Amino acid sequence: WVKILSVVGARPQFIKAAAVSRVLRASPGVREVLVHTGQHYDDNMSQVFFEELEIPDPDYHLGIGGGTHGQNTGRMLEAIEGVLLKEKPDWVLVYGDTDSTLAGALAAVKLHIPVAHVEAGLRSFNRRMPEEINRILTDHASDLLFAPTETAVQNLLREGIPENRIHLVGDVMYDAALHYGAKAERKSRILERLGLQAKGYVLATIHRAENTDDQERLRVILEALAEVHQEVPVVFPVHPRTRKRAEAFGLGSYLEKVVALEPVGYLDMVMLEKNARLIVTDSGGVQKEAYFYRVPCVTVREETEWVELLKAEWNYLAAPQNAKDLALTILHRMRTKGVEIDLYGDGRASQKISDFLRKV
Amino acid sequence: MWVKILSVVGARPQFIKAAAVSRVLRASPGVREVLVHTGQHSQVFFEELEIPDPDYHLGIGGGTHGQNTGRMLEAIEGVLLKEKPDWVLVYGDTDSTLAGALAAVKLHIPVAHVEAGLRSFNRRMPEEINRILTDHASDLLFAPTETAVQNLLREGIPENRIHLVGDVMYDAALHYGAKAERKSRILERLGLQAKGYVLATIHRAENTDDQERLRVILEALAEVHQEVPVVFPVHPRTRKRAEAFGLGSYLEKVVALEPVGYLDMVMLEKNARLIVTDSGGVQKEAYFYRVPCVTVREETEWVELLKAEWNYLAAPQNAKDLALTILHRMRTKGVEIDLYGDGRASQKISDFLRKVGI
Ligand SMILES: CC(=O)N[C@@H]1[C@@H](OP(=O)(O)OP(=O)(O)OC[C@H]2O[C@@H](n3ccc(=O)[nH]c3=O)[C@H](O)[C@@H]2O)O[C@H](C(=O)O)[C@@H](O)[C@@H]1NC(C)=O
Ligand SMILES: CC(=O)N[C@@H]1[C@@H](OP(=O)(O)OP(=O)(O)OC[C@H]2O[C@@H](n3ccc(=O)[nH]c3=O)[C@H](O)[C@@H]2O)O[C@H](C(=O)O)[C@@H](O)[C@@H]1NC(C)=O
Ligand SMILES: [Cl-]
Ligand SMILES: [Cl-]
Ligand SMILES: [Cl-]
């Protein structure tokens, strides 16, 4: 048998790990160990993902979070190593691009434990972004690089990573949407709770530091969504950090002018995404999900790593410079669509991953 | 024009590199330096380098990679938040190096890597990962060799961030040569004459943490000693391992010493017939003095020394074979060639740090 240990720190990593774990559980000589590093350690940011997505309780919860980059990363590196020394996994899988991701990779490679990066080779080319540093360092530390796009493959080849370590497997978050979609239909009643008609609202999520730590950007965003809301209802599950910033800068009243919610579980999120007329976000996962449901998307950033979405016209960049401009862009984009194209694979990225963790 | 340049150093070879750089930075009064020592607070060997005492001793060491690295990352960041330097300099390829780079980059403090782009292409070595990741985290890459330059370019690091400045350890050797000649009495003390001995240092974990591999080395040196005396300043950790494994009697069969200071090291190296080492710095220094070298490893990053035939790899598989290799190479010389720059790597580094821009 082979032991495959997964390190997960945050909501989007739990969702990626859910897809992979589902395939590895069904595999003959594979034992899974799951380490939760403690970054997201809430109900609506963590536990709801474990229950709804049928993820077995983590074997370890490290309880680390809320410090500086150096504190969080340093403590995680030591604590993850401690677990690796006990468990002696044959593979460590790390996901996405947070400090957890880097800490796991760095803990493993120094113990000569093979590392594979799920969602490898994404680049913003903005080296000041902490996650840009994280994915670069993770990718160079890894033994296997599971890229979701051709752009990701090209990015890894450009940095001298050898072709035989890189596999274009598609996106496990597509696997997740495809596999949990029926379940979301059979359990979520969020549209009824909120009194929404299918295709009678816009859905917004905003959590990037660039957008929430800069008062003028966050004011543009919140004023824009209030304007949009007068035309078409805006539903907004608000990230807790985003809520705290809006309150801190005196912008809380804008949340009261839309249908602002606390963060929702994945099943409700699927139902909201599926039924939205348009999605406005700065989330990586959410902009891909918009495309999964063929809902037009606006990404409130100067760039995205998911460039194929822009090229296929499913997604559109709108930097938050002016509230009225952003509102008008949102309104205009909601009656657009992109081209016919199949991105991110067949929904079996996870069994491709599993197969490679046998063969290599 | 007032800029603060903070240097992160772990062990001996990093102090020697940082000393070379700091001797040049001291010539710019608008440059304030801060020196952060990641280990504990000997103070003589320290002073031969003409460096002020460290501003900080974080006192981290003796654990696993994850412990040492994780503790250092958090402690270095703490200092950076206090000191708010304009530049962080990291040196070489240890866990201290990577911890300093990681601490800085996430605070948006520019990092320069002294000794950038070296590659073994074997990730069994922790230092390989360390230097790859440090390089990809760095704003300025100070490469010692053309090979290092080509390694950095192949990994997609842009040309305008890479500078071939040569090796600060050649600067150091050039700077301290005369003082060593004037002040060192080690040959007199040991009873050796020029070209009458072989010098050995061994400190790599892979060579000292396996009983039978360390036995191969110590037995080889005992055999060599029967033909030509072997002078062996033993790294303290090498001696601890040797004692723990029950191999200490082998140290009595050569001229085993405690670690020596830099000036005495210059004198030993310069006057040796052959140097046998697993040190990166000593490999180069053997070449500086045109003394043949045998590297007790499966690879070296300093590949120019192999091509110029000044160095030769002898993995420690068999005591007899390693001894014979050592004795055969003692009668060799490499080709005349100018590696590692003009002794002014440190000046080039300082020039780049001071003009790069905010
Ligand atoms: C630093 C950064 O922002 N890195 C990116 C970051 O992802 P994301 O931005 O997508 O974070 P999120 O938006 O918090 O979660 C979305 C999910 O929550 C669900 N979601 C959303 C809201 C909600 O209320 N309920 C939900 O279930 C949605 O349905 C989605 O399934 O972290 C990822 C990771 O480390 O794995 C990186 O892969 C990633 N990098 C890229 C390039 O996409
Ligand atoms: C992991 C590893 O072994 N990395 C390498 C490691 O250096 P080295 O192997 O040279 O360590 P050392 O041999 O302990 O010191 C030599 C000096 O001590 C003097 N030395 C020596 C013995 C003595 O008794 N007295 C002395 O004065 C000698 O005269 C020398 O000047 O750490 C360096 C660093 O991080 O900066 C890396 O750049 C380097 N990687 C390469 C590629 O060379
Ligand atoms: Cl969010
Ligand atoms: Cl289609
Ligand atoms: Cl040594």
Author numbering:
A (entry chain A): 2 to 361
B (entry chain B): 1 to 41, 47 to 363
The article reads:
The final step in the pathway is catalyzed by a 2-epimerase, which utilizes UDP-2,3-diacetamido-2,3-dideoxy-d-glucuronic acid as its substrate. The focus of this investigation is on the ORF WP_011172736, which we demonstrate encodes for a 2-epimerase. We have also demonstrated that the T. thermophilus enzyme is allosterically regulated by UDP-GlcNAc. Whereas the sugar 2-epimerases that function on UDP-GlcNAc have been the focus of past biochemical and structural analyses, this is the first detailed investigation of a 2-epimerase that specifically utilizes UDP-2,3-diacetamido-2,3-dideoxy-d-glucuronic acid as its substrate.
The next structure solved in this investigation was that of the WT enzyme crystallized in the presence of its substrate, UDP-GlcNAc3NAcA at pH 5.0 (structures 2 and 3). The model was refined at 1.8 Å resolution with an overall R-factor of 18.2%. The α-carbons for the two subunits superimpose with an RMSD of 0.8 Å. As observed for other 2-epimerases, there is a significant closure of the gap between the N- and C-terminal domains upon UDP-sugar binding as highlighted in Figure 5. The uracil ring is positioned into the active site by the backbone amide and carbonyl oxygen of Val 265 and a water molecule. Glu 290 lies within hydrogen bonding distance to the ribosyl oxygens. The pyrophosphoryl moiety is surrounded by the side chains of Arg 12, His 208, and Ser 284. The pyranosyl moiety is anchored into the active site by the side chains of Gln 14, Lys 17, Asp 98, Glu 120, and Trp 307. In both subunits A and B, there is a chloride ion located within ∼3.2 Å of the side chain of Arg 12.
